[PDB]
Design a binder for these strands. Sequence first.
DNA 1: GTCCCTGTTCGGGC
Length: 44
Amino acid sequence: NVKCFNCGKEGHTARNCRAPRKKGCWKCGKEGHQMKDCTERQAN
DNA sequence: GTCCCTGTTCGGGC
Ligand SMILES: [Zn+2]
Ligand SMILES: [Zn+2]
């Protein structure tokens, strides 16, 4: 399973989510890199 | 192919 980054809901991922998405790193906020890329404070 | 999975509009991959 998974949880959508663009909205939260399971079943799909952000790419599949037909919703308004963010510019930068979904988790931390910064843009200069992506959520996958980021290893700032990915505790939970 | 049921379950897994991520950077665009939009479900493809095994
Ligand atoms: Zn979503
Ligand atoms: Zn980040």
